[PDB]
PDB file of C-alpha atoms in Angstrom:
ATOM      1  CA  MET A 326      43.137  69.989  31.575  1.00  0.00           C
ATOM      2  CA  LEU A 327      40.575  69.244  28.839  1.00  0.00           C
ATOM      3  CA  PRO A 328      37.907  71.905  28.108  1.00  0.00           C
ATOM      4  CA  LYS A 329      34.560  70.585  29.330  1.00  0.00           C
ATOM      5  CA  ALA A 330      32.673  72.663  26.759  1.00  0.00           C
ATOM      6  CA  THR A 331      34.603  70.962  23.947  1.00  0.00           C
ATOM      7  CA  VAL A 332      34.079  67.446  25.329  1.00  0.00           C
ATOM      8  CA  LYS A 333      30.345  68.009  25.761  1.00  0.00           C
ATOM      9  CA  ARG A 334      30.146  69.442  22.240  1.00  0.00           C
ATOM     10  CA  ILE A 335      31.668  66.240  20.845  1.00  0.00           C
ATOM     11  CA  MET A 336      29.416  64.083  23.041  1.00  0.00           C
ATOM     12  CA  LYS A 337      26.367  65.821  21.588  1.00  0.00           C
ATOM     13  CA  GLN A 338      27.611  64.879  18.130  1.00  0.00           C
ATOM     14  CA  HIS A 339      26.765  61.294  19.158  1.00  0.00           C
ATOM     15  CA  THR A 340      23.540  61.764  21.157  1.00  0.00           C
ATOM     16  CA  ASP A 341      20.399  63.849  21.122  1.00  0.00           C
ATOM     17  CA  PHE A 342      20.114  63.363  24.899  1.00  0.00           C
ATOM     18  CA  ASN A 343      20.749  66.084  27.427  1.00  0.00           C
ATOM     19  CA  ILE A 344      24.024  65.553  29.310  1.00  0.00           C
ATOM     20  CA  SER A 345      24.620  66.472  32.934  1.00  0.00           C
ATOM     21  CA  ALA A 346      27.643  68.458  34.088  1.00  0.00           C
ATOM     22  CA  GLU A 347      28.662  65.506  36.270  1.00  0.00           C
ATOM     23  CA  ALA A 348      28.572  63.166  33.259  1.00  0.00           C
ATOM     24  CA  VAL A 349      30.823  65.501  31.284  1.00  0.00           C
ATOM     25  CA  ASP A 350      33.233  65.663  34.245  1.00  0.00           C
ATOM     26  CA  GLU A 351      33.453  61.874  34.444  1.00  0.00           C
ATOM     27  CA  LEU A 352      34.250  61.499  30.740  1.00  0.00           C
ATOM     28  CA  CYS A 353      36.889  64.234  31.082  1.00  0.00           C
ATOM     29  CA  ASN A 354      38.395  62.314  34.005  1.00  0.00           C
ATOM     30  CA  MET A 355      38.535  59.100  31.969  1.00  0.00           C
ATOM     31  CA  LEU A 356      40.019  60.964  28.997  1.00  0.00           C
ATOM     32  CA  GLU A 357      42.788  62.424  31.177  1.00  0.00           C
ATOM     33  CA  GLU A 358      43.571  58.977  32.583  1.00  0.00           C
ATOM     34  CA  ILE A 359      43.763  57.663  29.005  1.00  0.00           C
ATOM     35  CA  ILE A 360      46.149  60.448  27.970  1.00  0.00           C
ATOM     36  CA  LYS A 361      48.329  59.615  30.982  1.00  0.00           C
ATOM     37  CA  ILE A 362      48.650  55.887  30.474  1.00  0.00           C
ATOM     38  CA  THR A 363      48.979  56.071  26.668  1.00  0.00           C
ATOM     39  CA  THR A 364      51.768  58.627  26.999  1.00  0.00           C
ATOM     40  CA  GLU A 365      53.571  56.554  29.625  1.00  0.00           C
ATOM     41  CA  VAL A 366      53.330  53.383  27.523  1.00  0.00           C
ATOM     42  CA  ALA A 367      54.413  55.309  24.420  1.00  0.00           C
ATOM     43  CA  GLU A 368      57.521  56.556  26.266  1.00  0.00           C
ATOM     44  CA  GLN A 369      58.358  52.997  27.316  1.00  0.00           C
ATOM     45  CA  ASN A 370      58.078  51.975  23.670  1.00  0.00           C
ATOM     46  CA  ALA A 371      60.364  54.760  22.430  1.00  0.00           C
ATOM     47  CA  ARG A 372      62.923  53.746  25.069  1.00  0.00           C
ATOM     48  CA  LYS A 373      63.033  50.166  23.775  1.00  0.00           C
ATOM     49  CA  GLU A 374      64.221  51.662  20.458  1.00  0.00           C
ATOM     50  CA  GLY A 375      66.692  54.051  22.113  1.00  0.00           C
ATOM     51  CA  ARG A 376      64.716  57.148  21.136  1.00  0.00           C
ATOM     52  CA  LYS A 377      63.932  60.232  23.207  1.00  0.00           C
ATOM     53  CA  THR A 378      60.967  61.146  20.977  1.00  0.00           C
ATOM     54  CA  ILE A 379      57.544  59.508  21.023  1.00  0.00           C
ATOM     55  CA  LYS A 380      56.438  58.589  17.506  1.00  0.00           C
ATOM     56  CA  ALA A 381      53.257  57.150  16.036  1.00  0.00           C
ATOM     57  CA  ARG A 382      54.933  53.738  16.096  1.00  0.00           C
ATOM     58  CA  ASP A 383      54.922  53.860  19.918  1.00  0.00           C
ATOM     59  CA  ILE A 384      51.143  53.441  20.014  1.00  0.00           C
ATOM     60  CA  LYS A 385      50.783  49.768  19.141  1.00  0.00           C
ATOM     61  CA  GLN A 386      48.130  47.191  18.368  1.00  0.00           C
ATOM     62  CA  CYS A 387      49.339  43.747  19.348  1.00  0.00           C
ATOM     63  CA  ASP A 388      48.342  41.018  16.938  1.00  0.00           C
ATOM     64  CA  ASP A 389      44.972  39.536  17.833  1.00  0.00           C
ATOM     65  CA  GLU A 390      46.366  36.393  19.462  1.00  0.00           C
ATOM     66  CA  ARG A 391      48.694  38.246  21.851  1.00  0.00           C
ATOM     67  CA  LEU A 392      46.084  40.887  22.676  1.00  0.00           C
ATOM     68  CA  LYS A 393      43.676  38.040  23.470  1.00  0.00           C
ATOM     69  CA  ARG A 394      46.064  36.681  26.109  1.00  0.00           C
ATOM     70  CA  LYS A 395      46.755  40.194  27.410  1.00  0.00           C
ATOM     71  CA  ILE A 396      43.037  40.828  27.883  1.00  0.00           C
ATOM     72  CA  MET A 397      42.488  37.437  29.520  1.00  0.00           C
ATOM     73  CA  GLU A 398      45.314  38.129  31.975  1.00  0.00           C
ATOM     74  CA  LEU A 399      43.855  41.590  32.628  1.00  0.00           C
ATOM     75  CA  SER A 400      40.571  39.921  33.617  1.00  0.00           C
ATOM     76  CA  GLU A 401      42.278  38.849  36.858  1.00  0.00           C
ATOM     77  CA  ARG A 402      43.793  42.207  37.869  1.00  0.00           C
ATOM     78  CA  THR A 403      40.409  43.911  38.387  1.00  0.00           C
ATOM     79  CA  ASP A 404      40.278  44.105  42.189  1.00  0.00           C
ATOM     80  CA  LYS A 405      43.068  46.723  42.350  1.00  0.00           C
ATOM     81  CA  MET A 406      42.146  48.311  39.007  1.00  0.00           C
ATOM     82  CA  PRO A 407      41.580  52.104  39.021  1.00  0.00           C
ATOM     83  CA  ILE A 408      37.924  53.149  38.860  1.00  0.00           C
ATOM     84  CA  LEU A 409      38.543  55.192  35.725  1.00  0.00           C
ATOM     85  CA  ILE A 410      39.976  52.092  34.026  1.00  0.00           C
ATOM     86  CA  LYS A 411      37.074  49.877  35.143  1.00  0.00           C
ATOM     87  CA  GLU A 412      34.753  52.491  33.626  1.00  0.00           C
ATOM     88  CA  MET A 413      36.661  52.463  30.333  1.00  0.00           C
ATOM     89  CA  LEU A 414      36.528  48.667  30.236  1.00  0.00           C
ATOM     90  CA  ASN A 415      32.847  48.710  31.161  1.00  0.00           C
ATOM     91  CA  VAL A 416      32.206  50.968  28.155  1.00  0.00           C
ATOM     92  CA  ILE A 417      34.345  48.846  25.813  1.00  0.00           C
ATOM     93  CA  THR A 418      32.714  45.599  26.905  1.00  0.00           C
ATOM     94  CA  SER A 419      29.204  47.103  26.830  1.00  0.00           C
ATOM     95  CA  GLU A 420      29.742  48.424  23.297  1.00  0.00           C
ATOM     96  CA  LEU A 421      31.092  45.224  21.686  1.00  0.00           C
TER      97      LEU A 421
ATOM     98  CA  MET B 299      38.125  67.180  16.699  1.00  0.00           C
ATOM     99  CA  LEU B 300      39.873  67.890  19.981  1.00  0.00           C
ATOM    100  CA  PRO B 301      42.455  70.690  19.939  1.00  0.00           C
ATOM    101  CA  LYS B 302      45.668  68.784  19.245  1.00  0.00           C
ATOM    102  CA  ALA B 303      47.759  71.445  20.997  1.00  0.00           C
ATOM    103  CA  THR B 304      46.029  70.978  24.342  1.00  0.00           C
ATOM    104  CA  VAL B 305      46.137  67.171  24.154  1.00  0.00           C
ATOM    105  CA  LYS B 306      49.898  67.326  23.549  1.00  0.00           C
ATOM    106  CA  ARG B 307      50.200  69.741  26.468  1.00  0.00           C
ATOM    107  CA  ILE B 308      48.505  67.168  28.729  1.00  0.00           C
ATOM    108  CA  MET B 309      50.838  64.479  27.345  1.00  0.00           C
ATOM    109  CA  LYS B 310      53.880  66.530  28.381  1.00  0.00           C
ATOM    110  CA  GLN B 311      52.698  66.461  32.004  1.00  0.00           C
ATOM    111  CA  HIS B 312      53.535  62.732  31.969  1.00  0.00           C
ATOM    112  CA  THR B 313      56.669  62.449  29.829  1.00  0.00           C
ATOM    113  CA  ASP B 314      59.920  64.352  29.396  1.00  0.00           C
ATOM    114  CA  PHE B 315      60.274  63.062  25.817  1.00  0.00           C
ATOM    115  CA  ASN B 316      59.609  65.006  22.655  1.00  0.00           C
ATOM    116  CA  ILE B 317      56.321  64.045  20.964  1.00  0.00           C
ATOM    117  CA  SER B 318      55.753  63.975  17.193  1.00  0.00           C
ATOM    118  CA  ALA B 319      52.668  65.412  15.502  1.00  0.00           C
ATOM    119  CA  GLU B 320      51.654  61.956  14.277  1.00  0.00           C
ATOM    120  CA  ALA B 321      51.732  60.543  17.814  1.00  0.00           C
ATOM    121  CA  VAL B 322      49.499  63.389  19.033  1.00  0.00           C
ATOM    122  CA  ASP B 323      47.110  62.718  16.127  1.00  0.00           C
ATOM    123  CA  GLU B 324      46.906  59.012  16.994  1.00  0.00           C
ATOM    124  CA  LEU B 325      46.066  59.686  20.632  1.00  0.00           C
ATOM    125  CA  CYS B 326      43.473  62.260  19.541  1.00  0.00           C
ATOM    126  CA  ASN B 327      41.856  59.623  17.325  1.00  0.00           C
ATOM    127  CA  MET B 328      41.725  57.309  20.364  1.00  0.00           C
ATOM    128  CA  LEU B 329      40.203  60.044  22.501  1.00  0.00           C
ATOM    129  CA  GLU B 330      37.519  60.842  19.907  1.00  0.00           C
ATOM    130  CA  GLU B 331      36.649  57.137  19.730  1.00  0.00           C
ATOM    131  CA  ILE B 332      36.412  56.957  23.541  1.00  0.00           C
ATOM    132  CA  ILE B 333      34.097  59.975  23.555  1.00  0.00           C
ATOM    133  CA  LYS B 334      31.904  58.251  20.967  1.00  0.00           C
ATOM    134  CA  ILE B 335      31.579  54.883  22.619  1.00  0.00           C
ATOM    135  CA  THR B 336      31.271  56.259  26.182  1.00  0.00           C
ATOM    136  CA  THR B 337      28.409  58.515  25.057  1.00  0.00           C
ATOM    137  CA  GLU B 338      26.708  55.735  23.091  1.00  0.00           C
ATOM    138  CA  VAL B 339      26.865  53.327  26.041  1.00  0.00           C
ATOM    139  CA  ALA B 340      25.771  56.124  28.401  1.00  0.00           C
ATOM    140  CA  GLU B 341      22.683  56.812  26.266  1.00  0.00           C
ATOM    141  CA  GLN B 342      21.754  53.112  26.383  1.00  0.00           C
ATOM    142  CA  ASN B 343      22.014  53.051  30.193  1.00  0.00           C
ATOM    143  CA  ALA B 344      19.906  56.211  30.311  1.00  0.00           C
ATOM    144  CA  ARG B 345      17.299  54.528  28.088  1.00  0.00           C
ATOM    145  CA  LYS B 346      17.242  51.353  30.183  1.00  0.00           C
ATOM    146  CA  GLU B 347      16.089  53.540  33.111  1.00  0.00           C
ATOM    147  CA  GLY B 348      13.615  55.570  31.064  1.00  0.00           C
ATOM    148  CA  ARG B 349      15.571  58.822  30.917  1.00  0.00           C
ATOM    149  CA  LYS B 350      16.394  61.282  28.150  1.00  0.00           C
ATOM    150  CA  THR B 351      19.353  62.783  30.058  1.00  0.00           C
ATOM    151  CA  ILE B 352      22.807  61.238  30.420  1.00  0.00           C
ATOM    152  CA  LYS B 353      23.829  61.410  34.074  1.00  0.00           C
ATOM    153  CA  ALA B 354      27.004  60.376  35.888  1.00  0.00           C
ATOM    154  CA  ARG B 355      25.347  57.074  36.878  1.00  0.00           C
ATOM    155  CA  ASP B 356      25.290  56.113  33.169  1.00  0.00           C
ATOM    156  CA  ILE B 357      29.098  56.094  33.125  1.00  0.00           C
ATOM    157  CA  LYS B 358      29.153  53.090  35.373  1.00  0.00           C
ATOM    158  CA  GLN B 359      31.040  50.207  36.866  1.00  0.00           C
ATOM    159  CA  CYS B 360      29.172  47.025  37.691  1.00  0.00           C
ATOM    160  CA  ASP B 361      30.802  44.540  40.051  1.00  0.00           C
ATOM    161  CA  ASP B 362      34.307  43.192  39.806  1.00  0.00           C
ATOM    162  CA  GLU B 363      32.417  39.935  39.153  1.00  0.00           C
ATOM    163  CA  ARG B 364      30.420  41.042  36.109  1.00  0.00           C
ATOM    164  CA  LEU B 365      33.336  43.107  34.786  1.00  0.00           C
ATOM    165  CA  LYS B 366      35.669  40.098  35.042  1.00  0.00           C
ATOM    166  CA  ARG B 367      33.212  38.032  32.987  1.00  0.00           C
ATOM    167  CA  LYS B 368      32.851  40.680  30.274  1.00  0.00           C
ATOM    168  CA  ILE B 369      36.635  41.120  30.022  1.00  0.00           C
ATOM    169  CA  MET B 370      36.960  37.364  29.512  1.00  0.00           C
ATOM    170  CA  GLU B 371      34.287  37.416  26.802  1.00  0.00           C
ATOM    171  CA  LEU B 372      35.959  40.495  25.309  1.00  0.00           C
ATOM    172  CA  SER B 373      39.136  38.435  24.823  1.00  0.00           C
ATOM    173  CA  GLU B 374      37.261  36.266  22.306  1.00  0.00           C
ATOM    174  CA  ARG B 375      36.131  39.318  20.284  1.00  0.00           C
ATOM    175  CA  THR B 376      39.397  40.665  18.839  1.00  0.00           C
ATOM    176  CA  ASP B 377      38.160  40.129  15.268  1.00  0.00           C
ATOM    177  CA  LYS B 378      35.337  42.681  15.558  1.00  0.00           C
ATOM    178  CA  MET B 379      37.580  45.135  17.442  1.00  0.00           C
ATOM    179  CA  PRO B 380      38.424  48.342  15.560  1.00  0.00           C
ATOM    180  CA  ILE B 381      42.089  49.321  15.572  1.00  0.00           C
ATOM    181  CA  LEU B 382      41.488  52.226  17.966  1.00  0.00           C
ATOM    182  CA  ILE B 383      39.859  49.927  20.535  1.00  0.00           C
ATOM    183  CA  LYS B 384      42.763  47.489  20.147  1.00  0.00           C
ATOM    184  CA  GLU B 385      45.232  50.290  20.830  1.00  0.00           C
ATOM    185  CA  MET B 386      43.285  51.373  23.902  1.00  0.00           C
ATOM    186  CA  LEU B 387      43.246  47.794  25.209  1.00  0.00           C
ATOM    187  CA  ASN B 388      46.930  47.373  24.381  1.00  0.00           C
ATOM    188  CA  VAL B 389      47.674  50.504  26.409  1.00  0.00           C
ATOM    189  CA  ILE B 390      45.510  49.328  29.331  1.00  0.00           C
ATOM    190  CA  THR B 391      47.126  45.864  29.374  1.00  0.00           C
ATOM    191  CA  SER B 392      50.638  47.287  28.982  1.00  0.00           C
ATOM    192  CA  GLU B 393      50.282  49.897  31.751  1.00  0.00           C
ATOM    193  CA  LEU B 394      48.451  49.049  34.975  1.00  0.00           C
TER     194      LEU B 394
END
């Protein structure tokens, strides 16, 4: 589990606002979901190369044209999308 | 700066593979970026409602209808996407 005091400390490096305990909890939940799915994808990537060790190369950025299709296809898998993932995407789309 | 040891410990709850230091560092970079943009978007939602406190409601999901539209429009914005956001989106579109 991630330490809530550390997450809130980092949050307050990006805002002067007060931050509720429930808000910190929700970010921690999203962060844990991110750790989970990145690690699972990284393992799948190490497997494709026959490795049993996750390396930096297993966290990938697809070239812009493939990632553009992959996002467009994702736009139509929202109805069964985990809440934590919808929240992440809401943040990413609200920020850009 | 999240503690890299505890992030790797969370990773190992989801994979049996070894994990290199550089992989842990990469994920930590992603997590720090997520903390930043989630807090920045949260503050904006707090402001829109006249508050100076980030609450759980500011880490939000709209509808599956508005989210679907923003994910479509996100697909046309790869060029302004920082690498860390691209890696997050690659993970999300590779996983589930």
